[PDB]
């Protein structure tokens, strides 16, 4: 069977980014959810290379 | 035949105030809970500190 | 002294409705509405409609919602129940006297103003499956169901419990049509126990003038006979064997009811050998240990079934049945005492009297009489009627059983249970 | 029409007299053509030893199989031929033998009861037959999960004490008990200060006393003497018994605190609070809309197949709580909800539900007391436990007195922060740990 | 939508929880006084007293 | 004499708001708890017996 | 959109000295923010329901 | 009766058109927020209306996706807007409120 | 069973046999519901030992050789002794069974005792059948000789 579904970690990723039923329908105003996440890590990753030196 | 079941004797374990089949237990309850609860109170008091 | 009693008061209304009350001066009250509406008035197309109906007794009415019927009745510690037999349905209602009027309103609501809402009825269908599952965990329930199926073509053959194929299939139109066609004035009686006759007569004239479905107790059951057989292993063969007797309230009916007590109904003595029981004694001579027998006596409007009901071990089934059968044959051939009959008479007389000792029992019986018979018949004259059964009437009843086209139901490991053919 | 209060005053005085002897002899008289008589005995099981447990059970089995004056099935043949029913029970505390008869038959009825209760042909042949019957009855009983869990619940709650014992006794005693053993117990217990002859129905009380002196004169004889004891108190423990068996499809649970017993005023308030919680069963119409929150949630969330509240009631002690039957997956939720009812009621009982409460009781009491048999039993039991018949108008007054404060006080006294006796049987993996049961007997919020 | 909650039983429910919800404030306040050593209230207190003022 | 059931024999079912579902009549069991190994259920997929509204002070 | 353009005012004004014009519009925009969210947007939604016979 | 209630009717009809759910084939009751009472009323709907309800919402979510509108003929007319839910909604609420009164006593 | 019984004919012919015979032919092709989960490895063991024996058996082969079969048989199929006789003997009895439904349509079968296989009387019945009418011959036909 398909291990994406069953494996305890990947399960979480599958439920959240893969197989998750989302609406047919949601507009560009929906995209800011991901983009906050991107901003969050990009902050972290440029923040850290700052802290090496700060 | 499910009537051959008696509960094992716990006398070794029973606190003293609860040793008599002949007398109520409703009585020692207060002191008994009192006692065990005091312990936990005292403990939090210390912990708090 | 407790007092002067009262007498029952009894009124045929000109639309055919019956009203009876006692003021026995009781702390609580019982109102039943008895309706010629039992399973017999179902047909091929709507079987089980009256079962679903029996269950449906607290779905929403025109001002009273389900929630209210439940909450209102529980608020007073009341009770609302329905009892089908194959002939009638009986909505009875029980509370303290200070609370009649609220319970009356709910009663009339349930019986004259059900809405049978689509969604409420859909929700209720699973309950037939549970309800049947509980009932049928008596082996006797299956047997008496198949007994009737086998005995009649017709109407009495219908079961008390909805056929499995029908569960989920009985519609709000079917219930609507059931109540409109069967819950009508001439099919009805309103019995009251510590209410007053004025109050009942008022309720009835105000709220229970409903004309016109139907008439007649009247398909007419056609007796037919034959046999049904359910392979099992359950532990034990239950078998019933029966022939056409006599309609309720005929004289011939009472002869059968005596013959039953000659032969043997239930026990009298906790863990007793049942020494005056003809059938039991007869089987026991043959048969070592575990069995039961009783004489079986069903009387309807129209018809009735008599004979006996055996429980045995699977191998002992033929022996138990064949013994029991011969014992009847022995009465038919003329072997009855006087005192043999007299003790049956006492067993029956005392029995009837005892069945009406209590509110639940009296009320059911008064209701049952109203519909059966259009009368109240007091116990002294019941005892009068019992007493009028001659010995020869009892013989002749046995003679009727023995010569009659037979009807049989059996369940179990049936490989030693006989076949009619073989009896 | 008469009012309900009016109707409570209407029921005749239960009428008590004594023999010069100590047989109390008592009647409620009525218009019925039909009656119930017989003998309620202060004998028990709470009375038997360990050795000689099962004895009263064994007597009940023998009591009807013959007398010296009525040998073999002579007695049977007599009862049957007048269309009477003859019956008996034994509880942990109480034995009864009773006849339902025609009222014209009250002479022979009392006469036969006399003969049974005094002249019991304990014939050696028969005691050998009945030992096999009873061992069969024991095998029968093991299949009744309900019958079992309550025996367990007695076994664990009153571990140590006579009250821990079954009525039937254990297999080994049935197998072993002698003719001697039985007449020993019979001599000990069936003596006349510890019997009431109750009747109810179409009788005069004069008429009954005549029949008492006719047929019961000389038991205490002269007699009792020497070796009357009373009962000791029984210790309530609480404590858990868990009989794991994943082959039976549904779990039974019985969970109880100690009650106060027969005499205590505050049974009325306990029964009120109990009635608020009430009982469910899957064949109850109306689900969803039931008053009792336990019953409501049970039905909506299918939690359950039945439950029932109880207030079992002994000399100076008691079991107070609840029994239920459910899926293996439900035992937890069902535990939660039952406990939560108790605690809501200990802390925050409200006025309306308490009235419902009171009404369910008035309805129960009056409905129960209907028929010569129920009423005769009530004469019966009540005289042994209370010393009077407590008349209906009294119970009303005692019911009327309960408000919300009474409930949440009286619930608190018995239930709040108390160790229960727990008993499980069936697929009971998911039955809460005792600690966690114990921890549901109080609120951190309260 | 406020409105629901007003009636004899709710009046009853209020009253039955009054000893508790004020015993909780008593917990709350003594708690808050102790944990900060408050000064204003704690100067009043007939042992506790002799930790500052002397 | 007329109570089509407790002429004592044919079936009568009974439902309720409050108390528990009943069935009827007569039929034996009855002299057959009494000789023995007649179990049965008491309590699987099911319901309670004599039952309730049945009581005390 | 009035909220958004009110927010755009409020962003401009804080970017901007505390001094004649400036103050009182800033004051008014402040009121308006709280007025739209607390009072005006709720009332619109009620009005809209009344117009739909709802 | 009169000439003024058909201005209120005219204003209503305007707002309706401004609301613009009809532009996506929707009836007014298609657009109701699904709270608890509303959820029950959808549940109580018979098979025909539920089936038409879902197709309507499927239509409009489809349009809504490709950011389109229906042809002007096929918009739903104000007159003709069928409030199929309301009788069921009213009744669900009627019951919730009976429950709520019982809870007070 | 669930698959098989989704023909109405399967139920009918099952009840037909049940009704016709006391005995042995009355037994069904399909296990009674009460028995599902109840039939033991001892019962199967006893079934094969008592019925799968030499005198109850035949070994038919199609494009094998007779030597090879005779060999297989003499080597591998000498098993004596359960039982004999075709021999309970079925007792014809008769009577009727009736299953209320709505299915769309009444299926009914009506039948009497005829003749054992391979008697002459059997062939007469097999002719009478073809007089009266077995299945179709002609796709979507009026069945004119029936
Ligand atoms: C279509 O709309 C969206 C969702 O709903 C239907 C989501 O569920 C997610 C999931 C969120 C992710 C991958 C980034 C969040 C990162 C952190 C660290 C919290 C995204 C991206 C999205 O666009």
Short mmCIF file of C-alpha atoms in Angstrom, two decimals, chain D residues 29-443:
data_model
loop_
_atom_site.label_atom_id
_atom_site.label_comp_id
_atom_site.label_asym_id
_atom_site.label_seq_id
_atom_site.Cartn_x
_atom_site.Cartn_y
_atom_site.Cartn_z
CA UNK D 29 -58.02 -4.58 54.32
CA UNK D 30 -59.81 -3.78 51.03
CA UNK D 31 -62.83 -4.59 48.80
CA UNK D 32 -60.92 -7.04 46.52
CA UNK D 33 -62.23 -10.71 46.23
CA UNK D 34 -58.65 -11.85 46.42
CA UNK D 35 -55.74 -11.61 48.85
CA UNK D 36 -52.10 -12.20 49.67
CA UNK D 37 -50.81 -13.85 52.90
CA UNK D 38 -47.87 -14.96 54.52
CA UNK D 39 -44.72 -14.89 56.51
CA UNK D 40 -41.81 -12.49 56.40
CA UNK D 41 -38.80 -13.70 58.40
CA UNK D 42 -35.78 -11.76 59.79
CA UNK D 43 -33.56 -14.45 58.22
CA UNK D 44 -31.04 -13.91 55.79
CA UNK D 45 -27.48 -14.63 54.81
CA UNK D 46 -26.11 -11.75 56.66
CA UNK D 47 -26.96 -14.43 59.30
CA UNK D 48 -25.02 -17.46 57.95
CA UNK D 49 -21.34 -18.26 58.65
CA UNK D 50 -19.09 -19.49 55.90
CA UNK D 51 -19.65 -23.05 56.76
CA UNK D 52 -23.51 -22.97 56.55
CA UNK D 53 -23.76 -20.20 53.91
CA UNK D 54 -26.31 -21.24 51.25
CA UNK D 55 -28.51 -22.68 54.02
CA UNK D 56 -31.56 -20.40 53.77
CA UNK D 57 -31.45 -20.87 50.04
CA UNK D 58 -31.38 -24.61 50.68
CA UNK D 59 -34.44 -24.31 53.03
CA UNK D 60 -36.43 -22.29 50.41
CA UNK D 61 -35.82 -25.19 48.07
CA UNK D 62 -37.08 -27.70 50.72
CA UNK D 63 -39.91 -25.62 52.20
CA UNK D 64 -42.53 -26.74 49.67
CA UNK D 65 -41.63 -30.46 49.19
CA UNK D 66 -43.53 -31.68 52.21
CA UNK D 67 -44.55 -31.41 55.82
CA UNK D 68 -45.07 -34.05 58.52
CA UNK D 69 -48.83 -33.28 58.12
CA UNK D 70 -48.68 -32.91 54.30
CA UNK D 71 -46.14 -35.47 52.97
CA UNK D 72 -44.63 -35.26 49.44
CA UNK D 73 -46.60 -33.20 46.92
CA UNK D 74 -49.72 -33.20 49.09
CA UNK D 75 -49.15 -29.49 49.76
CA UNK D 76 -48.69 -28.68 46.05
CA UNK D 77 -51.91 -30.58 45.19
CA UNK D 78 -53.80 -28.53 47.83
CA UNK D 79 -52.59 -25.06 46.71
CA UNK D 80 -53.17 -25.92 43.02
CA UNK D 81 -56.72 -27.27 43.54
CA UNK D 82 -57.96 -23.99 44.99
CA UNK D 83 -56.24 -22.05 42.20
CA UNK D 84 -53.86 -20.37 44.59
CA UNK D 85 -50.24 -19.44 43.78
CA UNK D 86 -47.46 -20.28 46.25
CA UNK D 87 -44.14 -18.45 46.19
CA UNK D 88 -40.97 -17.48 48.06
CA UNK D 89 -37.85 -15.37 48.11
CA UNK D 90 -34.65 -15.01 50.18
CA UNK D 91 -32.45 -11.93 50.16
CA UNK D 92 -29.32 -11.18 52.14
CA UNK D 93 -31.55 -10.01 55.00
CA UNK D 94 -35.10 -11.34 54.55
CA UNK D 95 -37.01 -14.52 53.68
CA UNK D 96 -40.63 -14.58 52.56
CA UNK D 97 -43.18 -17.27 51.83
CA UNK D 98 -46.55 -16.14 50.34
CA UNK D 99 -49.88 -17.37 48.93
CA UNK D 100 -52.03 -15.52 46.41
CA UNK D 101 -55.50 -16.85 46.99
CA UNK D 102 -59.19 -16.21 46.85
CA UNK D 103 -60.25 -14.35 50.04
CA UNK D 104 -62.70 -17.13 51.06
CA UNK D 105 -59.58 -19.33 51.15
CA UNK D 106 -57.77 -17.33 53.87
CA UNK D 107 -58.36 -20.17 56.45
CA UNK D 108 -56.45 -22.79 54.40
CA UNK D 109 -53.86 -20.28 53.21
CA UNK D 110 -52.67 -19.30 56.69
CA UNK D 111 -53.00 -22.99 57.69
CA UNK D 112 -50.63 -24.08 54.93
CA UNK D 113 -48.18 -21.31 55.75
CA UNK D 114 -48.16 -22.37 59.37
CA UNK D 115 -47.40 -25.95 58.26
CA UNK D 116 -44.57 -24.82 55.88
CA UNK D 117 -43.02 -22.36 58.28
CA UNK D 118 -42.96 -24.84 61.25
CA UNK D 119 -43.26 -28.52 60.12
CA UNK D 120 -40.85 -28.80 57.21
CA UNK D 121 -40.20 -32.56 56.40
CA UNK D 122 -36.49 -32.11 55.49
CA UNK D 123 -36.47 -35.62 54.01
CA UNK D 124 -32.99 -37.01 53.31
CA UNK D 125 -33.98 -38.30 49.85
CA UNK D 126 -35.18 -34.76 48.99
CA UNK D 127 -32.16 -32.79 50.31
CA UNK D 128 -30.12 -35.00 47.98
CA UNK D 129 -32.40 -34.08 45.03
CA UNK D 130 -32.22 -30.37 45.75
CA UNK D 131 -28.48 -30.21 45.96
CA UNK D 132 -28.32 -31.09 42.23
CA UNK D 133 -31.14 -28.60 41.37
CA UNK D 134 -29.22 -25.83 43.21
CA UNK D 135 -25.87 -26.65 41.58
CA UNK D 136 -27.72 -26.35 38.25
CA UNK D 137 -29.13 -22.97 39.45
CA UNK D 138 -25.57 -21.83 40.18
CA UNK D 139 -24.56 -22.66 36.56
CA UNK D 140 -27.67 -20.88 35.34
CA UNK D 141 -26.76 -17.80 37.39
CA UNK D 142 -23.17 -17.44 35.97
CA UNK D 143 -24.66 -16.60 32.58
CA UNK D 144 -26.68 -13.73 33.97
CA UNK D 145 -23.91 -11.04 33.83
CA UNK D 146 -26.20 -8.64 35.80
CA UNK D 147 -26.76 -11.20 38.64
CA UNK D 148 -22.98 -11.73 38.77
CA UNK D 149 -21.84 -8.04 38.91
CA UNK D 150 -24.07 -7.31 41.87
CA UNK D 151 -22.67 -10.34 43.69
CA UNK D 152 -19.15 -9.13 42.93
CA UNK D 153 -20.18 -5.62 44.09
CA UNK D 154 -21.38 -7.11 47.38
CA UNK D 155 -18.26 -9.29 47.53
CA UNK D 156 -15.90 -6.29 47.23
CA UNK D 157 -17.81 -3.54 49.09
CA UNK D 158 -18.41 -5.73 52.17
CA UNK D 159 -15.23 -7.89 51.92
CA UNK D 160 -14.70 -9.40 55.33
CA UNK D 161 -18.31 -9.25 56.42
CA UNK D 162 -21.46 -11.55 56.30
CA UNK D 163 -22.81 -9.00 53.78
CA UNK D 164 -20.09 -10.00 51.29
CA UNK D 165 -21.87 -13.36 50.82
CA UNK D 166 -24.33 -14.53 48.11
CA UNK D 167 -27.77 -15.90 49.08
CA UNK D 168 -27.08 -19.20 47.27
CA UNK D 169 -23.67 -19.72 48.94
CA UNK D 170 -20.62 -21.19 47.14
CA UNK D 171 -20.50 -24.52 45.24
CA UNK D 172 -18.70 -26.35 48.10
CA UNK D 173 -21.35 -25.65 50.75
CA UNK D 174 -24.30 -26.79 48.58
CA UNK D 175 -22.23 -29.97 47.90
CA UNK D 176 -21.58 -30.58 51.59
CA UNK D 177 -24.41 -29.11 53.76
CA UNK D 178 -26.13 -31.65 56.03
CA UNK D 179 -29.73 -32.29 57.15
CA UNK D 180 -28.40 -31.44 60.66
CA UNK D 181 -26.91 -28.11 59.37
CA UNK D 182 -30.33 -27.02 58.08
CA UNK D 183 -32.50 -27.83 61.14
CA UNK D 184 -29.76 -26.10 63.15
CA UNK D 185 -30.34 -22.86 61.12
CA UNK D 186 -34.13 -23.45 61.12
CA UNK D 187 -34.22 -23.77 64.98
CA UNK D 188 -31.97 -20.68 65.19
CA UNK D 189 -33.91 -18.32 62.96
CA UNK D 190 -37.53 -19.31 62.35
CA UNK D 191 -38.64 -18.09 65.77
CA UNK D 192 -41.61 -16.02 66.29
CA UNK D 193 -40.27 -12.51 67.31
CA UNK D 194 -38.60 -12.60 63.88
CA UNK D 195 -41.75 -13.34 61.85
CA UNK D 196 -44.57 -11.17 60.62
CA UNK D 197 -47.67 -12.76 59.19
CA UNK D 198 -48.83 -10.12 56.73
CA UNK D 199 -52.04 -10.23 54.68
CA UNK D 200 -53.74 -7.79 52.18
CA UNK D 201 -57.11 -7.62 50.41
CA UNK D 202 -60.61 -8.90 51.13
CA UNK D 203 -60.13 -9.86 54.77
CA UNK D 204 -61.09 -8.74 58.25
CA UNK D 205 -58.10 -8.26 60.68
CA UNK D 206 -59.98 -9.99 63.57
CA UNK D 207 -60.37 -13.00 61.18
CA UNK D 208 -56.58 -13.05 60.62
CA UNK D 209 -55.66 -12.94 64.34
CA UNK D 210 -57.99 -15.93 64.97
CA UNK D 211 -56.06 -17.77 62.31
CA UNK D 212 -52.78 -16.66 63.90
CA UNK D 213 -53.62 -18.03 67.37
CA UNK D 214 -55.14 -21.12 65.68
CA UNK D 215 -51.98 -22.12 63.76
CA UNK D 216 -48.95 -20.26 65.12
CA UNK D 217 -49.42 -20.71 68.91
CA UNK D 218 -46.21 -22.09 70.40
CA UNK D 219 -43.16 -21.21 68.48
CA UNK D 220 -41.47 -19.04 71.12
CA UNK D 221 -43.36 -21.43 72.78
CA UNK D 222 -41.74 -21.20 75.70
CA UNK D 223 -38.38 -20.60 74.27
CA UNK D 224 -36.30 -18.09 72.54
CA UNK D 225 -33.76 -17.93 75.52
CA UNK D 226 -30.08 -18.08 75.27
CA UNK D 227 -28.41 -17.47 71.80
CA UNK D 228 -30.35 -14.91 70.11
CA UNK D 229 -27.63 -12.72 68.70
CA UNK D 230 -28.26 -9.65 66.55
CA UNK D 231 -26.17 -8.65 63.52
CA UNK D 232 -22.84 -6.91 63.81
CA UNK D 233 -22.21 -3.90 61.60
CA UNK D 234 -20.54 -4.54 58.28
CA UNK D 235 -17.54 -2.56 57.29
CA UNK D 236 -17.80 -1.05 53.83
CA UNK D 237 -14.46 -1.15 52.05
CA UNK D 238 -14.52 -0.04 48.46
CA UNK D 239 -12.12 -1.49 46.50
CA UNK D 240 -12.58 -2.86 42.92
CA UNK D 241 -13.26 -6.28 41.49
CA UNK D 242 -12.49 -6.70 37.76
CA UNK D 243 -13.38 -9.93 35.97
CA UNK D 244 -11.87 -9.49 32.54
CA UNK D 245 -13.59 -11.61 29.88
CA UNK D 246 -13.41 -10.32 26.26
CA UNK D 247 -15.68 -13.18 25.17
CA UNK D 248 -18.84 -11.56 26.49
CA UNK D 249 -19.98 -8.89 24.03
CA UNK D 250 -20.99 -6.19 26.50
CA UNK D 251 -19.46 -4.87 29.74
CA UNK D 252 -21.32 -4.66 32.99
CA UNK D 253 -20.29 -2.12 35.59
CA UNK D 254 -21.66 -1.51 39.05
CA UNK D 255 -20.27 1.40 41.07
CA UNK D 256 -21.52 2.42 44.54
CA UNK D 257 -20.84 4.43 47.68
CA UNK D 258 -22.00 3.27 51.14
CA UNK D 259 -25.56 4.14 51.99
CA UNK D 260 -27.04 4.53 55.52
CA UNK D 261 -29.76 1.81 55.40
CA UNK D 262 -33.37 1.19 56.31
CA UNK D 263 -33.97 3.40 59.17
CA UNK D 264 -32.25 6.61 58.15
CA UNK D 265 -34.38 9.69 57.31
CA UNK D 266 -32.21 10.69 54.36
CA UNK D 267 -33.10 7.78 52.01
CA UNK D 268 -36.01 9.83 50.69
CA UNK D 269 -33.59 12.60 49.48
CA UNK D 270 -31.23 9.96 48.05
CA UNK D 271 -34.07 8.33 46.13
CA UNK D 272 -35.14 11.77 44.85
CA UNK D 273 -31.61 12.52 43.60
CA UNK D 274 -31.41 8.99 42.14
CA UNK D 275 -34.69 9.51 40.24
CA UNK D 276 -33.34 12.73 38.67
CA UNK D 277 -30.58 10.51 37.15
CA UNK D 278 -33.05 7.65 36.66
CA UNK D 279 -32.62 4.84 34.14
CA UNK D 280 -32.20 4.19 30.46
CA UNK D 281 -32.62 1.29 28.15
CA UNK D 282 -32.29 1.20 24.41
CA UNK D 283 -36.09 0.47 23.94
CA UNK D 284 -37.10 3.74 25.59
CA UNK D 285 -38.89 5.91 23.14
CA UNK D 286 -37.70 9.51 23.22
CA UNK D 287 -34.03 9.84 23.43
CA UNK D 288 -32.58 13.06 22.69
CA UNK D 289 -35.40 14.74 24.61
CA UNK D 290 -35.26 12.83 27.91
CA UNK D 291 -35.04 14.98 31.08
CA UNK D 292 -32.14 13.19 32.73
CA UNK D 293 -28.87 14.48 31.30
CA UNK D 294 -27.28 11.02 31.74
CA UNK D 295 -30.18 9.43 29.81
CA UNK D 296 -30.20 12.18 27.18
CA UNK D 297 -26.42 11.97 26.37
CA UNK D 298 -26.48 8.17 26.60
CA UNK D 299 -29.19 7.96 23.97
CA UNK D 300 -27.82 10.64 21.57
CA UNK D 301 -24.24 9.38 21.73
CA UNK D 302 -25.30 5.62 21.96
CA UNK D 303 -23.25 5.19 25.14
CA UNK D 304 -25.03 2.42 26.63
CA UNK D 305 -27.64 -0.24 26.26
CA UNK D 306 -29.05 0.26 29.69
CA UNK D 307 -28.23 1.88 32.96
CA UNK D 308 -30.08 2.05 36.31
CA UNK D 309 -29.70 3.96 39.61
CA UNK D 310 -30.18 2.12 42.96
CA UNK D 311 -30.27 2.59 46.69
CA UNK D 312 -29.80 -0.96 48.06
CA UNK D 313 -30.65 -0.95 51.61
CA UNK D 314 -29.50 -3.12 54.57
CA UNK D 315 -29.47 -2.91 58.36
CA UNK D 316 -27.35 0.25 59.16
CA UNK D 317 -25.71 0.24 55.66
CA UNK D 318 -26.32 0.38 51.96
CA UNK D 319 -25.11 0.44 48.39
CA UNK D 320 -25.83 3.71 46.56
CA UNK D 321 -25.05 4.24 42.92
CA UNK D 322 -25.52 2.91 39.44
CA UNK D 323 -25.18 -0.10 37.12
CA UNK D 324 -24.70 -0.04 33.35
CA UNK D 325 -24.19 -2.21 30.28
CA UNK D 326 -22.19 -1.05 27.14
CA UNK D 327 -19.73 -1.55 24.28
CA UNK D 328 -16.18 -2.10 25.32
CA UNK D 329 -15.39 1.29 23.74
CA UNK D 330 -17.89 3.18 25.88
CA UNK D 331 -17.01 2.31 29.44
CA UNK D 332 -15.00 5.43 29.89
CA UNK D 333 -17.53 7.94 28.51
CA UNK D 334 -20.26 6.21 30.53
CA UNK D 335 -18.18 6.43 33.70
CA UNK D 336 -17.48 10.10 33.05
CA UNK D 337 -21.05 11.08 32.60
CA UNK D 338 -22.47 9.16 35.52
CA UNK D 339 -19.82 10.72 37.91
CA UNK D 340 -20.55 14.12 36.46
CA UNK D 341 -24.20 13.76 37.25
CA UNK D 342 -23.42 12.86 40.90
CA UNK D 343 -21.13 15.88 41.28
CA UNK D 344 -23.38 18.39 39.53
CA UNK D 345 -26.00 17.19 41.98
CA UNK D 346 -23.67 17.42 45.06
CA UNK D 347 -22.72 20.99 44.23
CA UNK D 348 -25.38 22.56 42.02
CA UNK D 349 -28.79 20.73 42.13
CA UNK D 350 -31.54 23.11 40.94
CA UNK D 351 -35.13 23.46 42.10
CA UNK D 352 -37.04 22.21 39.04
CA UNK D 353 -35.25 18.88 38.55
CA UNK D 354 -35.74 18.28 42.28
CA UNK D 355 -39.50 18.59 41.81
CA UNK D 356 -39.34 16.13 38.91
CA UNK D 357 -37.39 13.93 41.20
CA UNK D 358 -40.08 14.20 43.91
CA UNK D 359 -42.86 13.50 41.37
CA UNK D 360 -41.20 10.40 39.87
CA UNK D 361 -41.06 9.13 43.46
CA UNK D 362 -44.68 9.84 44.33
CA UNK D 363 -45.52 8.12 41.05
CA UNK D 364 -43.21 5.14 41.80
CA UNK D 365 -44.53 4.68 45.33
CA UNK D 366 -48.16 4.78 44.53
CA UNK D 367 -47.77 2.63 41.35
CA UNK D 368 -45.78 0.02 43.23
CA UNK D 369 -48.39 -0.32 45.97
CA UNK D 370 -51.08 -1.73 43.65
CA UNK D 371 -52.20 -5.29 44.12
CA UNK D 372 -52.55 -7.41 47.25
CA UNK D 373 -49.13 -9.05 46.56
CA UNK D 374 -47.17 -5.72 46.46
CA UNK D 375 -49.11 -4.40 49.49
CA UNK D 376 -48.73 -7.62 51.51
CA UNK D 377 -44.98 -7.57 50.82
CA UNK D 378 -44.96 -3.98 51.99
CA UNK D 379 -46.58 -4.92 55.29
CA UNK D 380 -44.28 -7.74 55.39
CA UNK D 381 -40.93 -6.07 54.84
CA UNK D 382 -41.80 -2.81 56.59
CA UNK D 383 -42.66 -4.34 59.94
CA UNK D 384 -39.33 -6.24 59.94
CA UNK D 385 -37.28 -3.17 58.99
CA UNK D 386 -39.19 -0.15 60.44
CA UNK D 387 -41.45 -1.53 63.17
CA UNK D 388 -44.46 0.32 61.68
CA UNK D 389 -46.09 0.56 58.37
CA UNK D 390 -45.05 4.04 57.34
CA UNK D 391 -48.33 5.26 55.78
CA UNK D 392 -48.50 6.88 52.36
CA UNK D 393 -49.29 10.36 53.62
CA UNK D 394 -46.03 10.20 55.68
CA UNK D 395 -43.85 9.31 52.68
CA UNK D 396 -45.56 12.24 50.85
CA UNK D 397 -44.64 14.61 53.66
CA UNK D 398 -41.07 13.24 53.66
CA UNK D 399 -40.99 13.62 49.85
CA UNK D 400 -42.49 17.18 50.01
CA UNK D 401 -39.72 18.25 52.50
CA UNK D 402 -36.90 17.78 49.95
CA UNK D 403 -35.79 20.85 48.08
CA UNK D 404 -32.58 21.54 46.07
CA UNK D 405 -30.66 22.33 49.31
CA UNK D 406 -31.78 18.99 50.75
CA UNK D 407 -30.53 17.23 47.59
CA UNK D 408 -27.13 18.89 47.37
CA UNK D 409 -26.58 18.47 51.14
CA UNK D 410 -27.69 14.80 51.25
CA UNK D 411 -25.87 13.95 48.00
CA UNK D 412 -22.77 15.62 49.38
CA UNK D 413 -22.87 13.64 52.65
CA UNK D 414 -22.90 10.28 50.81
CA UNK D 415 -21.21 10.91 47.47
CA UNK D 416 -18.74 13.83 47.69
CA UNK D 417 -15.11 12.76 47.93
CA UNK D 418 -15.86 9.18 48.84
CA UNK D 419 -14.20 5.86 47.97
CA UNK D 420 -16.62 3.67 45.92
CA UNK D 421 -17.00 -0.05 45.57
CA UNK D 422 -16.52 -0.78 41.80
CA UNK D 423 -17.29 -4.06 40.03
CA UNK D 424 -16.61 -4.99 36.42
CA UNK D 425 -17.30 -8.01 34.23
CA UNK D 426 -16.86 -8.52 30.48
CA UNK D 427 -14.75 -6.62 27.95
CA UNK D 428 -13.48 -4.24 30.55
CA UNK D 429 -10.03 -3.14 29.25
CA UNK D 430 -11.24 0.41 29.16
CA UNK D 431 -12.77 0.57 32.62
CA UNK D 432 -11.01 3.49 34.40
CA UNK D 433 -8.28 2.78 36.91
CA UNK D 434 -9.48 3.00 40.57
CA UNK D 435 -7.54 6.14 41.17
CA UNK D 436 -9.22 7.74 38.23
CA UNK D 437 -12.64 6.55 39.30
CA UNK D 438 -11.75 7.88 42.77
CA UNK D 439 -10.69 11.21 41.31
CA UNK D 440 -14.07 11.61 39.59
CA UNK D 441 -15.74 11.74 43.03
CA UNK D 442 -14.65 15.38 43.45
CA UNK D 443 -14.29 18.53 41.41
#
